[PDB]
Amino acid sequence: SLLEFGKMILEETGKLAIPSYSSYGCYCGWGGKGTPKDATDRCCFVHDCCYGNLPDCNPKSDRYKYKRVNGAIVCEKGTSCENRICECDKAAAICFRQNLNTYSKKYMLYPDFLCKGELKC
């Protein structure tokens, strides 16, 4: 679920999902057009694609379980949708951590009109 993803993001990064990742660049918190602005935004692009892989799942609301094994995220077995959603979220959280070095506050509340053009998953 979105709330679980937000907790995972905070755990990974030390940033609150709202506001740090809820309105960032062209793809975080809202897709779905434009060239991603930076690596963090590309995490969101890929995460959006990852959810897009799951048209019959409901990633905003469906809850999954996960644990930590020495810092590592391990998605625990739920329904097929839950497992796949968890894997999408895990990847994005790791991606955000891997790109914290280049996170730029200037991309918070990035305006829509600067995000133009289709980029295929």
Ligand SMILES: CS(=O)(=O)Nc1ccc([N+](=O)[O-])cc1Oc1ccccc1
């Ligand atoms: C913000 S919301 O109402 O909870 N919906 C939603 C949540 C996350 C994302 N996103 O891009 O990560 C995008 C979201 O919304 C959109 C999905 C597709 C296209 C436009 C917006």
